[PDB]
Ligand binder design. Structure first.
Ligand SMILES: CCCCCCCCCCCCCCCCCC(=O)OC[C@H](COP(=O)([O-])OCC[N+](C)(C)C)OC(=O)CCCCCCCCCCCCCCCCC
Ligand SMILES: CCCCCCCCCCCCCCCCCC(=O)OC[C@H](COP(=O)([O-])OCC[N+](C)(C)C)OC(=O)CCCCCCCCCCCCCCCCC
Ligand SMILES: CCCCCCCCCCCCCCCCCC(=O)OC[C@H](COP(=O)([O-])OCC[N+](C)(C)C)OC(=O)CCCCCCCCCCCCCCCCC
Ligand SMILES: CCCCCCCCCCCCCCCCCC(=O)OC[C@H](COP(=O)(O)OCCN)OC(=O)CCCCCCCCCCCCCCCCC
Ligand SMILES: CCCCCCCCCCCCCCCCCC(=O)OC[C@H](COP(=O)(O)OCCN)OC(=O)CCCCCCCCCCCCCCCCC
Ligand SMILES: CCCCCCCCCCCCCCCCCC(=O)OC[C@H](COP(=O)(O)OCCN)OC(=O)CCCCCCCCCCCCCCCCC
Ligand SMILES: CCCCCCCCCCCCCCCCCC(=O)OC[C@H](COP(=O)(O)OCCN)OC(=O)CCCCCCCCCCCCCCCCC
Lengths: 177, 87, 606, 171, 128, 459, 50
C-alpha cells in the first residue's frame, strides 16, 4: 500500500498482517485471558494448516477468502491502544511539542537563566552548520541518476561526519514534554 | 504516575517475557540471539512475540517496524527510541 | 430581607473575584487552584444561608438592581430571582464543583496550564449561576451562550488533538440548533406578550401558546441532548475527566430541563406540549440505554447513562411533575459526578486506559473507589433509601398512576431495566474477575485530594436525597394510593435487569464463540445515527457550499450576467467603430448617406 | 424615597414567630451578627457621608415645557409651527412610553408580591395594563420608523372615519 | 456465504477486499515502482530544503499554490455556457429566490388580510 | 462641524512638515487627540437633533459613525506603518495624506444636511480608496479590483444623482430638515417605481446587495491593511446611512417595492455564509462574512420598523469594529508567513498564545456572543423580521448556525492543531500588534456597558 | 469612558420617567383615564364629509 522503502507488500507480509489483525480482533471478542488463549491456539492451528502450500493461485485465493472471513467477523469497535491512532490519548501532547527553533527568539534576559544549556545549544548549532555541506556532498554523489528509487537515506561512510539529514530527527521533541 | 524507564529495566523485562515463552529454551537465549536462525522460530512466532511485547509495554509497534525486530537488542533499541529514555 | 439579598449578591461577587485576581496578576500565582477551591467553599457556605432562610419561611425575592436599557416600552434590568429552584440548585452546584476542583487539583497536577484550566472551570460556574438565577430571557440567553462557549473551550482542552476539535465543534452545532429554538421562543414572547421578564409572562398567561412551547422544547432538546440532537453528549468525552464530571454530568446538561422547569405555568395548561415532551423523553431514555448496553469505553457508558437520566427527567416533566423533575436533578448531580470521579481515578491508575476490557481485579486493589462506585451504581439504579430512591421511584409511581401514553410508560420501564443492566455490567467488568491490565503496576489512590472529594460526594450520595426531600415544601399532591403491582414496578424491574445482566456476564465467561448479530451491531454502533448523519449532512452542506454557491453562482454566473457581458459588448462595439480603412472617399460617401437619410427618412428640414 | 401613590404597595403583614421546638434557629443568631458586624459600620459610614453632604446644599430642577399649539392648528408646509408641534408630539410620545413602563412595573410587582394567589389578587393591575396598552396601541402603533405627528393625525382620522361609519351602519 | 460488502459514496471499499490489490503482474509492479520513485524524489527535494541550517522562512509548496489558483482563478477561463451550466444556474440561482418570494408573499397577504378584519389577536402587541 | 474639519485639514501640514522619522508619531498623536475631541457630539436631545449650521447637522444616527471614523484613523496609522517601512518618504507622506483626506470626506459625509452635498462627499470618497488600493496593494489584480469597485459604484450612483436633482426640482429643497416636514406620499406608478430604483440602487451596490457584491472579495482582498480596514469599517456603512436618510421620501411605495431585495438578501446571507464555509483564503472569508452581515442590515432597513432601525445601526457599528479587528489579525499572519492561504500556517496557539486569545475574542464577537453589541443588533433585527413574517426565524436560525460554524472553522484551522513543520520564521508578537488588537477590542467590550449611545435616533 | 458614564441625561430618558410619574399621579388622583385612544382632540378635527 503506502510504504517508504518498498513499492509493494509481499504475500508473506499480507499473511502476517492478517494474522495480527485477526488475533487482535479475536482478543477483542474474547475479553478473558484463558478464553482468548484457547481461541488463539485454534486460530494458530488454522493458520498452520495451510502453511505449506506451493500453489500461488491457491494461496492467493486462501488469502482472499481469509480476508472476507475476517471482514464478516470483525469487532464493531476493537481494542485500540491509548497512544495508537484512533486511541483516546492519540496526539494528545501535540499542543506541548514546541519546536526547538523557538529558542532563538528568546530575550537575552530570560536566556541568562540557563547559561550552560544555551552554551550547549550553541555548540550543537555549530556542529550542525559545520556538517551540513559535507552531508549534502555525500548525498549528492550517492543518489543514482534519475532520482532516488526509495526513501531510505545512507549512513555516514567515513569517520568524523554525521549521517545526512539528521537534525530534525535527532532534535525532535520528547513524547512527554 | 508514569515511572521512568532505563535500558537495564527494558532489557530485563523483555528477557523476562521472552523467557516465559515455552518455545524458547531459557538457558540458550541472550540479548542478541536471532529468531529464525539462532532459535529456530517461524514468522508467526515472531508476530506472536511482537504482540506479547506490545502487551507487556502497553504501546503498539507498527507492522512496518515489527517485521524488522529480529533479536532482543533491536526490540530494546526500538522501545528506547520510541519512549526517549536516557535523557 | 437585608441579609437575604446581601448574601446572594455577595455569593455571586465572591465567585467572580478570582477571575479579576488572575487577570491582574504579574508573577506566578502561589497555589492559585487552592485559592479558587477556598473561594468556592466560602461561596457555598454564603449561598447556603439564604436557602436556610427560604426553608424556614418560604421567602422568595426578586432583585432588579441595575437598570441596563430601555427599548421603547421594553425595559431590561439586571434582575436576579431567588425562588425555590435557585436556592435548591445553587448550593448543590457549588458543592459538586468544590469536589470537582479538589479532584482537579489531584488529576491535572502535571498539566503546565493548570491555572487556565481552573479559570475556565470558574468561568463555566459563573455563567451557569447567571443562567439559573436569571429573571428575563436576555440574561437567560447570556448564561445559555456562556455555558455553550465554555463547553467548547473545555472539550477541546488538548487543542493539538483533532478529535477534540471535532467534538467541540459538533457540540457547538447542536447547541446552536437549540439556540434557534430559544430565539424563536423569545421572539414570540416579545411580539405577542410585550415582555421578556418572566413575571409578566406568567401574569398574562396565553392560551394559544403552542409555538413558544415548541421553541422551548427544541432548545431543551439541543441543550439536554434529547433524541435527534443527542450524539454531542457522548462525543464530548474527549475532554479531561473533571470537565466531563462537572459539565456533561451534573451542571451544564441539565440546563434544558431547568429551562422547561422554569416555564411550568405555561406547560401545565397545554396537553400537546406535555405529550410531545413525554414522547421525546421516553424515546431518549430507551434509545440511549440500549446504546449503553454494549459499550466498552467507561466514560462513554457514563455519558449514555446521564443522557438516559435526562430522558427520564423529560418524561417526568411530560407527566406534569416538574418539582419531581427538579428533585431528580438535585439527586442525580451527586452520584453522577462521583461516578465520573471514580472512573477518572481508575483511568489515572492504569496509565490513561479507558477500556473496561483492560480492567478487572480492582475490588481489592483500590478499595475506596470500589466502595464509592458500588454505592453510586446502587444509588443510580434506585436502591431503597439511598439518594436516588427519593426521586426516581416517585417519578415511576407518578408515571404509572396517571393519564399517560402507554408506549412512553413501557419504554420508561424497559429503560429502567437497562440502567440496572449496564450498571452491573460496569461493576462486573471493572472490578470483578482477574486482572487484564498491563504487567507493571503503579496502582495508587493515596492522595488526600482525591479521597476527600470522593468522600464528600459519597456522603452527599448517601444522605442528600433524604435531607432535600424532607426539607422542600409540598408544591403538589403526592399520589400514594395505588395497587400492589404498580408500587413494586420499579424495584421488580431493576431486580430483573440485575438478574438478566448477571446471567449475561456468566454466559460471557464461558468458552464459546458466536458471530455477532444485527442487534449487537445496532446497539454497539450507536444505532447508526452518527455514522449516517455526520457523514451525510456535512457532505451535502459542503458540496452545496462549493459546487453551487462558491463556484457556479458567484464565480461563474453572477460574474457572467452583469460585468462580463457588458464588457464584451463594449469591446465588440469599439472594434466595429474603430475599424475604418482611412479613405476619404468612404467618409464622404457616409456623409452623403447621412444627408440623404436626414432629409428624406427623418424629415429634419420640416 | 419615592412617591407611594404612583407606585402603590399594600401594607406589610408579617406573622409573629412561634418557636414550637426547642432547637435554636441559626437565622436569629445570623441576624444578630449581621446587625452587629455589617449594619452598624455601614450606617456609621453613611452618617458621615450625609454629614459631609449637608455642609453644602444645591438643587436641581425638573424641566417644565409650556404647551404650544399642536399639528391640528398648523398650516401645511409652515416649518416653524409644524416644528414646534412635532417637538411637542415627540415629547408626549416619550412620556407615554414611560407611562406604559410604569404600569408594566406595577403588574410585575403585583405578580411577584401576591405569590401563588396572583391570578385572583392582581385583577386591577391586569385591567389597568390592558386599558393602557389598548390606548397606546390605538395611539402609536403601525407608524413605522419614520413616525411623525402627521402620520398619527392621519391614523386617528382614519380610525374616526371607521368609527363614524360603524355607528352609521348600526343606526 | 458471507454478505458481500457493497461500497457507497460515503463508505469506500476496504483495501483488503479489493480484487486489484492482489495483482502480481509486472505492469502493476512497474507502476508501483514509478510512483515510489516520484514520491521519493519529491521527498528528497523537500528534505533538502527542510534541513538547511541557513534557511529561515517558508519552504514554498508549488502544489498548494497550484491548488489555490485552480480553486480561485481558473473557474471563469475554463467555463463554457452550455445546457448543463445554464440549467444548474437557473435551478440554484432563481429557484430558491422565487420559492421564498412566493412563501413570504402568501404569508404576509394572509396576515394583512386577517389584521384588517380584526380576526388576528393583537392585544398586547405594541412592539414592532 | 468646523471644529473637527479644521484639525483634520491641519493634519496635512503636520505630516508634510515633520521629520523623516517622526511622521508616524506626530500623525498618530494628533489624530488620537482629535478622536478624544470627537466625544462632544454626544449632546443629543430626545426631541431635536444637534443642528449646527445651514450645511451641517448631526443626529443620533450619524454620531456613532463619526466617532467610529475619527477613532479608526489612528488605528490605520498604527497598522499601515510596518509594510511601508522601506518606502520612499514622499510616498509615505502621500499615503498618510490620502488617509487624512479620506477621513475629512467621511466626516463631511455623515453631517451633510443637504442631500446633494451628501452625494458629492459620498462619491468624493471613491478617489482616495481607489488610489490606495491600486497603488499600495501587493498583487497583480489590484488594478482589476479597482476597476470593478469604481465602475460598480459609479454605475449604481449616476441614477441617484439624476433622481436627487429631480427631487430638488419637484419639491424645491434637498435640505433634510425641510424634507421631514414637506414630505409627500409617493403613489404607485412606473415613474415612481424607477424613482425608487434610482434612489436605492447606489446604496444597494455600496452596502452590498447579494448579486451586486462581486466587487467586494476583490477590493477587500487586494487592498493594503489600512485600505481593508477603512473599506470594511466605514465605507460599507455609507450605503446604510443613505438608505436610512432616503427612505423618508419613498413612502408608501417601499412596502411592495422592497420584496425582491428582501428575498435577495434573506437568501443571500445563506449563500455567502456557505461560501465562507469553503474558503481557502482568509481575507476572502472575512470579506464574505462582511457581505452576510450587510445583507442583515439591508433587510433591517427595508422592513422599516423602530426595532429594525436600532438593530441596524448597532449591527453596523459592531460589524465595523469586528471586521477591522479580523482584517488586522489576518494581516499580522500575512506579515509572518507571506501568504494568505488558510491551510498553510496552522497551530499558531503553541507559538503565539496572546494572539490566539485575540483571535478567540474576535471570533466570539463575530458569532454574536451576548451581551456584545453584535448580539444586540442581530437580536433586534431578528425580532423585527419575526414581526414581519414568521419563516424569517427559520432563515435567521440557519444563518446563525452557519455563522458560528465558519467563525469556529476559522479559529480551529488557524490557531489549533499541529503546527507547520517547515515554517520557522514565526516571530513573537510585537507590542504594536498587541496594542492594535487591544484598541480594537476594549471599546467593543466597553460599549456593552452603555449600549444606548449606538442605538440610532429613535432609541 | 468617564465622559460617556456621566453624560447629562442622554436623550431625555430620565426626564421622561419623571414627567411620566408626575402625569400618572395627577391622572390617578382625579379618576382620569391614564391614556386616551386619540392623541388629538376630536373636537378640533374636521372629518371629510361622506
Ligand atoms: C475596585 C475598587 C473600586 C472602588 C471601591 C470603593 C467604592 C465601592 C463602591 C461603594 C458604593 C458606591 C455607591 C453605590 C454604587 C453606585 C450606585 C448608583 O447609583 O449606581 C448608578 C447606577 C445604578 O442604576 P440606575 O438605575 O441608577 O441607573 C442606570 C443607568 N441608566 C439609567 C443610564 C441606564 O449604575 C450602577 O450601579 C452601575 C454598576 C452596576 C453593577 C453591575 C454591572 C454589571 C455589568 C454587566 C454588563 C452586561 C449586562 C447584560 C445584561 C443586562 C440585563 C439584561
Ligand atoms: C450597478 C448596476 C445597476 C444600476 C441600476 C441603477 C438603477 C436602475 C434604474 C435607473 C433608471 C434611470 C434613472 C431614473 C430616474 C428617475 C427619476 C424620475 O423622476 O423618474 C420619474 C420619471 C417620470 O418622467 P417625468 O417625471 O419627467 O414626468 C412627470 C411625471 N409623469 C410621467 C406623471 C408625467 O421617469 C422617467 O423619466 C423615466 C424613468 C425610467 C428610465 C428608464 C431608462 C433607464 C433604464 C435603466 C438603466 C440602468 C443603468 C444601466 C447601465 C448599467 C451599467 C452599464
Ligand atoms: C460610541 C460610538 C462609536 C463606537 C466606537 C468608539 C471608539 C472610541 C472609544 C472612546 C471611549 C469609549 C466610549 C464608550 C465607553 C463605554 C463604557 C462606558 O462609559 O460605560 C458607562 C457606564 C455607565 O453606567 P450607568 O449608566 O449604569 O451609570 C449610571 C450613571 N451615573 C454614573 C451618572 C450614575 O459605566 C458602567 O456601566 C460602569 C459600571 C461600573 C464598572 C463595571 C462593574 C462590573 C464589571 C464586571 C464585574 C464582573 C461581572 C462578571 C464577569 C464574569 C467573567 C466575564
Ligand atoms: C425535537 C425536534 C428534534 C429534531 C431532530 C431532527 C432535526 C435535526 C437533525 C440533525 C441535524 C444535525 C446533525 C447532522 C450534522 C452533524 C454535523 C457534525 O457535527 O458532525 C460531526 C462530525 C465529526 O464527528 P464524527 O464524524 O462523529 O467523528 C468521529 C471521529 N472522526 O463533524 C463534521 O463532520 C464537521 C462538519 C462541519 C460542517 C457541517 C455542515 C452541516 C451543518 C448542518 C446544519 C443544519 C441546520 C438546520 C437548521 C434548521 C432550522 C429550521
Ligand atoms: C433490595 C432487595 C435485595 C434482596 C432481594 C432480591 C435478591 C435478588 O434479586 O437476588 C437475585 C440475584 C442473586 O441471586 P442468584 O444470582 O441466584 O445468586 C447468586 C449466587 N449467590 O442478584 C442479586 O441479588 C444482585 C442484584 C440485587 C439488586 C438490588 C437493588 C436493585
Ligand atoms: C453591476 C455593474 C456591471 C458593469 C460594471 C462595469 C463593467 C465591468 C467592470 C469594469 C471592466 C472590467 C475589466 O477589466 O474588463 C476587462 C476587459 C478587457 O480589458 P483589457 O483592456 O483587455 O485588459 C488590460 C490588460 N489585461 O475590459 C473591456 O473589455 C472594457 C470594458 C469597458 C466597460 C466600461 C463600463 C461601461 C458602462 C456603460 C456601457 C454603456
Ligand atoms: C442580477 C443580479 C442579482 C439581482 C440584483 C437586483 C436585480 C433586481 C432589481 C429590480 C427588480 C424588479 C423591480 C422591482 C419589482 C417589484 C414588484 C413590482 O412592482 O413589479 C412591477 C409589476 C407588478 O405588476 P403591477 O402591480 O400590475 O404593476 C403596475 C404598477 N403600476 O411587475 C410586472 O408586471 C411583471 C414584470 C414586468 C416587467 C418589469 C420591468 C421593470 C422592472 C425591472 C427593471
Amino acid at each position: 500500500a503506502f510504504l517508504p522503502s518498498a513499492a509493494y507488500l509481499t504475500h508473506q507480509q499480507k499473511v502476517l498482517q492478517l494474522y495480527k489483525r485477526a488475533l487482535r480482533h479475536l482478543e477483542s471478542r474474547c475479553v478473558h485471558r484463558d478464553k482468548y488463549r484457547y481461541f488463539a491456539c485454534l486460530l494458530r492451528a488454522r493458520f498452520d494448516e495451510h502453511k505449506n502450500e506451493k500453489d500461488m493461485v491457491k494461496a492467493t485465493q486462501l488469502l482472499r477468502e481469509a480476508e472476507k472471513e475476517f471482514w464478516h467477523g470483525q469487532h464493531p469497535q476493537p481494542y485500540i491502544f491509548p497512544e495508537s491512532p484512533g486511541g483516546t490519548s492519540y496526539e494528545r501532547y501535540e499542543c506541548y511539542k514546541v519546536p526547538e527553533w523557538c529558542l532563538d527568539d528568546w530575550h537575552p534576559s530570560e536566556k541568562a537563566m540557563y547559561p550552560d544549556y544555551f552554551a550547549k545549544r550553541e555548540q550543537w548549532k555549530k556542529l550542525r552548520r559545520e556538517s551540513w555541506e559535507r552531508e549534502v556532498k555525500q548525498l549528492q554523489e550517492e543518489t543514482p541518476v534519475g532520482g532516488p528509487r526509495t526513501e531510505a537515506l545512507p549512513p555516514a561512510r567515513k569517520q568524523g561526519d554525521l549521517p545526512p539529514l539528521w537534525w530534525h530527527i535527532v532534535t525532535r521533541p520528547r513524547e512527554r514534554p | 504516575d508514569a515511572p521512568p524507564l532505563t535500558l537495564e529495566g527494558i532489557k530485563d523485562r523483555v528477557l523476562y517475557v521472552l523467557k516465559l515463552y515455552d518455545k524458547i529454551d531459557p538457558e540458550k537465549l541472550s540479548v542478541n540471539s536471532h529468531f529464525m536462525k539462532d532459535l529456530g522460530l517461524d514468522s508467526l512466532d515472531q508476530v506472536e512475540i511482537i504482540m506479547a511485547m506490545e502487551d507487556e509495554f502497553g504501546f503498539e509497534i507498527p507492522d512496518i517496524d515489527a517485521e524488522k525486530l529480529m533479536c532482543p537488542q533491536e526490540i530494546v533499541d526500538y522501545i528506547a527510541d520510541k519512549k526517549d529514555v536516557y535523557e | 430581607m437585608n441579609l437575604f439579598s446581601s448574601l446572594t449578591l455577595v455569593t455571586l461577587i465572591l465567585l467572580t473575584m478570582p477571575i479579576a485576581a488572575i487577570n491582574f496578576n504579574t508573577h506566578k500565582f502561589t497555589n492559585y487552584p487552592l485559592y479558587v477551591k477556598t473561594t468556592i467553599s466560602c461561596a457555598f457556605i454564603t449561598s447556603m444561608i439564604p436557602t436556610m432562610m427560604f426553608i424556614h419561611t418560604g421567602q422568595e425575592m426578586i432583585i432588579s438592581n441595575w437598570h441596563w436599557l430601555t427599548i421603547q416600552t421594553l425595559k431590561l434590568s439586571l434582575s436576579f430571582k431567588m425562588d425555590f429552584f435557585s436556592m435548591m440548585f445553587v448550593p448543590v452546584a457549588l458543592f459538586v464543583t468544590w469536589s470537582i476542583m479538589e479532584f482537579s487539583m489531584w488529576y491535572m497536577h502535571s498539566d503546565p496550564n493548570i491555572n487556565q484550566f481552573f479559570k475556565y472551570l470558574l468561568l463555566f460556574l459563573i455563567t451557569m449561576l447567571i443562567l439559573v438565577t436569571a429573571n428575563n430571557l436576555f440574561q437567560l440567553f447570556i448564561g445559555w451562550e456562556g455555558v455553550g462557549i465554555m463547553s467548547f473551550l473545555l472539550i477541546g482542552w488538548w487543542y493539538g488533538r483533532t478529535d477534540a476539535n471535532t467534538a467541540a465543534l459538533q457540540a457547538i452545532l447542536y447547541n446552536r440548533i437549540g439556540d434557534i429554538g430559544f430565539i424563536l421562543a423569545m421572539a414570540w414572547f416579545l411580539i405577542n406578550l410585550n415582555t421578556w421578564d418572566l413575571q409578566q409572562i406568567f401574569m398574562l398567561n396565553p392560551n394559544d401558546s403552542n409555538l413558544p412551547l415548541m421553541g422551548l422544547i427544541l432548545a431543551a432538546t439541543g441543550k439536554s441532548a434529547q433524541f435527534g440532537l443527542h450524539p454531542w453528549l457522548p462525543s464530548a468525552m474527549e475532554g479531561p475527566t473533571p470537565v466531563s464530571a462537572l459539565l456533561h454530568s451534573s451542571t451544564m446538561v441539565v440546563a434544558g430541563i431547568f429551562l422547561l422547569i422554569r416555564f411550568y405555568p405555561l406547560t401545565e395548561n397545554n396537553k400537546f406540549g406535555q405529550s410531545i415532551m413525554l414522547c421525546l423523553g421516553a424515546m431518549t431514555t430507551l434509545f440511549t440505554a440500549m446504546c449503553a448496553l454494549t459499550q466498552n469505553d467507561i466514560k462513554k457508558i457514563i455519558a449514555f447513562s446521564t443522557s438516559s437520566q435526562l430522558g427520564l427527567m423529560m418524561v417526568t416533566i411530560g407527566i406534569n411533575q416538574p418539582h419531581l423533575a427538579f428533585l431528580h436533578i438535585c439527586t442525580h448531580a451527586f452520584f453522577k459526578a462521583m461516578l465520573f470521579m471514580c472512573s477518572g481515578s481508575i483511568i489515572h491508575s492504569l496509565n490513561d486506559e479507558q477500556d473496561i476490557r483492560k480492567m478487572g481485579g480492582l475490588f481489592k486493589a483500590m478499595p475506596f473507589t470500589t466502595t464509592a462506585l458500588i454505592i453510586g451504581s446502587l444509588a443510580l439504579t434506585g436502591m431503597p433509601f439511598l439518594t436516588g430512591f427519593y426521586s426516581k421511584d416517585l417519578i415511576i409511581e407518578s408515571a404509572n398512576t396517571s393519564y399517560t401514553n402507554a408506549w412512553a410508560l413501557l419504554m420508561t420501564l424497559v429503560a429502567t431495566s437497562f440502567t440496572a443492566i449496564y450498571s452491573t455490567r460496569i461493576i462486573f467488568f471493572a472490578l470483578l474477575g482477574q486482572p487484564r491490565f498491563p504487567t507493571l503496576i503503579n496502582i495508587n489512590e493515596n492522595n488526600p485530594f482525591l479521597i476527600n472529594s470522593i468522600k464528600r460526594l459519597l456522603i452527599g450520595s448517601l444522605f442528600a436525597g433524604f435531607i432535600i426531600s424532607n426539607n422542600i415544601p409540598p408544591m403538589t399532591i403526592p399520589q400514594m394510593t395505588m395497587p400492589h403491582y404498580l408500587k413494586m414496578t420499579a424495584l421488580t424491574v431493576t431486580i430483573l435487569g440485575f438478574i438478566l445482566a448477571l446471567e449475561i456476564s456468566n454466559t460471557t465467561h464461558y468458552l464459546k464463540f458466536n458471530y455477532p448479530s444485527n442487534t449487537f451491531k445496532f446497539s454497539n454502533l450507536l444505532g447508526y445515527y452518527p455514522t449516517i448523519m455526520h457523514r451525510l449532512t456535512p457532505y451535502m452542506n459542503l458540496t452545496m457550499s462549493q459546487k453551487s454557491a462558491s463556484s457556479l453562482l458567484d464565480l461563474i454566473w453572477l460574474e457572467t450576467i452583469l460585468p462580463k457581458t457588458i464588457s464584451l459588448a463594449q469591446m465588440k462595439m469599439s472594434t466595429t467603430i474603430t475599424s475604418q480603412k482611412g479613405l476619404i472617399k468612404l467618409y464622404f460617401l457616409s456623409f452623403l448617406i447621412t444627408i440623404l437619410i436626414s432629409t428624406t427618412l427623418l424629415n429634419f428640414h420640416e | 424615597s419615592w412617591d407611594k401613590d404612583v407606585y402603590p404597595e399594600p401594607p406589610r403583614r408579617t406573622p409573629a414567630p412561634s418557636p414550637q421546638t426547642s432547637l435554636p434557629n441559626p437565622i436569629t443568631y445570623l441576624t444578630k451578627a449581621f446587625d452587629l458586624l455589617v449594619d452598624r459600620p455601614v450606617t456609621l459610614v453613611r452618617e458621615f457621608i450625609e454629614r459631609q453632604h449637608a455642609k453644602n446644599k444645591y438643587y436641581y430642577y425638573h424641566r417644565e415645557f409650556r404647551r404650544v399649539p399642536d399639528i391640528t392648528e398648523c398650516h401645511e408646509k409652515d416649518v416653524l409651527c409644524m416644528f414646534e408641534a412635532e417637538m411637542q408630539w415627540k415629547r408626549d410620545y416619550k412620556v407615554d412610553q414611560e407611562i406604559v413602563n410604569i404600569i408594566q412595573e406595577r403588574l410585575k410587582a403585583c405578580q411577584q408580591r401576591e405569590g401563588e394567589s396572583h391570578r385572583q389578587n392582581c385583577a386591577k393591575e391586569l385591567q389597568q395594563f390592558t386599558q393602557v396598552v389598548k390606548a397606546y396601541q390605538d395611539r402609536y402603533h403601525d407608524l413605522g420608523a419614520h413616525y411623525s405627528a402627521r402620520k398619527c393625525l392621519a391614523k386617528q382620522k382614519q380610525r374616526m372615519l371607521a368609527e363614524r361609519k360603524a355607528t352609521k351602519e348600526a343606526a | 456465504s458471507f454478505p458481500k460488502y457493497e461500497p457507497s459514496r460515503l463508505a469506500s471499499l476496504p483495501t483488503t477486499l479489493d480484487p486489484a490489490e492482489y495483482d502480481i503482474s509486472s505492469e502493476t509492479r512497474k507502476a508501483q515502482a514509478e510512483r515510489l520513485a516520484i514520491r521519493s524524489r519529491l521527498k528528497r527535494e523537500y528534505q533538502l530544503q527542510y534541513n538547511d541550517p541557513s534557511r529561515r522562512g517558508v519552504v514554498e509548496d508549488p502544489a498548494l499554490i497550484r491548488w489555490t489558483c485552480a480553486r480561485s482563478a481558473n473557474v471563469y477561463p475554463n467555463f463554457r455556457p452550455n445546457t448543463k451550466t445554464s440549467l444548474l444556474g437557473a435551478l440554484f440561482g432563481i429557484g430558491p429566490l422565487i420559492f421564498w418570494y412566493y412563501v413570504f408573499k402568501t404569508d404576509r397577504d394572509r396576515k394583512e388580510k386577517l389584521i384588517q378584519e380584526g380576526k388576528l389577536d393583537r392585544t398586547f402587541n405594541i412592539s414592532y | 462641524m468646523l471644529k473637527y474639519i479644521i484639525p483634520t485639514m491641519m493634519l496635512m501640514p503636520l505630516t508634510w512638515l515633520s521629520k523623516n522619522s517622526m511622521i508616524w508619531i506626530n500623525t498618530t498623536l494628533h489624530s488620537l487627540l482629535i478622536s478624544l475631541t470627537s466625544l462632544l457630539l454626544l449632546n443629543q436631545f430626545g426631541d431635536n437633533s444637534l443642528n449646527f449650521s445651514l450645511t451641517f447637522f448631526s443626529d443620533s444616527l450619524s454620531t456613532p459613525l463619526l466617532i467610529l471614523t475619527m477613532w479608526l484613523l489612528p488605528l490605520m496609522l498604527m497598522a499601515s506603518q510596518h509594510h511601508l517601512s522601506k518606502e520612499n518618504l514622499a510616498r509615505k507622506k502621500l499615503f498618510i495624506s490620502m488617509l487624512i483626506l479620506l477621513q475629512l470626506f467621511l466626516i463631511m459625509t455623515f453631517t451633510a444636511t443637504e442631500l446633494i452635498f451628501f452625494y458629492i462627499m459620498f462619491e468624493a470618497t471613491l478617489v482616495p480608496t481607489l488610489i490606495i488600493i491600486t497603488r499600495w496593494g501587493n498583487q497583480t489584480e489590484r488594478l482589476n479590483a479597482g476597476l470593478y469597485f469604481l465602475f460598480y459604484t459609479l454605475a449604481g450612483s449616476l441614477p441617484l444623482l439624476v433622481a436627487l436633482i429631480y427631487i430638488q426640482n419637484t419639491m424645491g429643497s434637498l435640505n433634510f430638515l425641510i424634507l421631514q416636514y414637506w414630505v409627500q406620499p409617493m403613489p404607485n406608478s412606473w415613474s415612481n417605481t424607477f424613482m425608487w430604483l434610482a434612489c436605492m440602487m447606489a446604496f444597494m451596490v455600496k452596502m452590498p446587495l447579494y448579486g451586486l457584491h462581486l466587487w467586494l472579495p476583490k477590493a477587500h482582498v487586494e487592498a493594503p491593511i489600512a485600505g481593508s480596514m477603512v473599506l470594511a469599517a466605514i465605507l460599507l456603512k455609507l450605503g446604510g446611512y443613505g438608505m436610512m436618510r432616503i427612505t423618508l421620501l419613498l413612502n408608501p411605495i417601499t412596502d411592495f417595492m422592497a420584496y425582491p431585495f428582501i428575498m435577495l438578501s434573506l437568501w443571500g446571507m445563506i449563500m455567502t455564509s456557505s461560501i465562507c464555509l469553503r474558503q481557502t483564503d482568509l481575507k476572502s472569508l472575512i470579506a464574505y462574512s462582511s457581505v452576510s452581515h450587510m445583507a442583515l442590515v439591508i433587510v433591517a432597513i427595508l422592513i422599516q420598523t423602530p426595532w429594525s432601525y436600532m438593530g441596524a445601526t448597532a449591527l453596523m457599528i459592531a460589524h465595523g469594529l469586528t471586521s477591522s479587528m479580523l482584517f488586522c489579525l489576518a494581516n499580522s499572519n500575512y506579515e509572518r508567513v507571506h501568504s494568505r492561504t488558510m491551510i498553510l500556517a496552522r497551530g499558531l496557539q503553541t507559538l503565539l498564545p496572546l494572539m490566539a486569545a485575540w483571535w478567540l475574542l474576535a471570533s466570539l464577537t463575530n458569532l454574536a456572543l451576548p451581551p456584545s453589541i453584535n448580539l444586540i443588533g442581530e437580536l433586534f433585527v431578528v425580532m423585527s423580521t419575526f414581526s414581519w413574517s414568521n419563516i424569517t426565524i427559520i432563515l435567521m436560525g440557519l444563518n446563525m448556525v452557519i455563522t458560528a460554524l465558519y467563525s469556529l472553522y476559522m479559529l480551529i484551522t488557524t490557531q489549533r492543531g499541529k503546527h507547520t513543520h517547515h515554517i520557522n520564521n514565526i516571530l513573537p508578537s510585537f507590542t504594536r500588534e498587541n496594542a492594535l488588537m487591544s484598541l480594537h477590542m476594549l471599546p467593543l467590550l466597553l460599549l456593552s456597558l452603555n449600549p444606548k449611545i449606538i442605538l440610532g435616533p429613535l432609541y | 469612558s468617564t465622559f460617556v458614564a456621566y453624560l447629562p441625561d442622554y436623550r431625555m430618558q430620565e426626564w421622561a420617567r419623571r414627567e411620566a410619574e408626575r402625569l400618572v399621579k395627577y391622572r390617578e388622583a382625579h379618576g382620569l383615564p391614564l391614556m386616551e385612544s386619540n392623541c388629538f382632540d376630536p373636537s378640533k378635527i374636521q372629518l371629510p364629509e361622506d
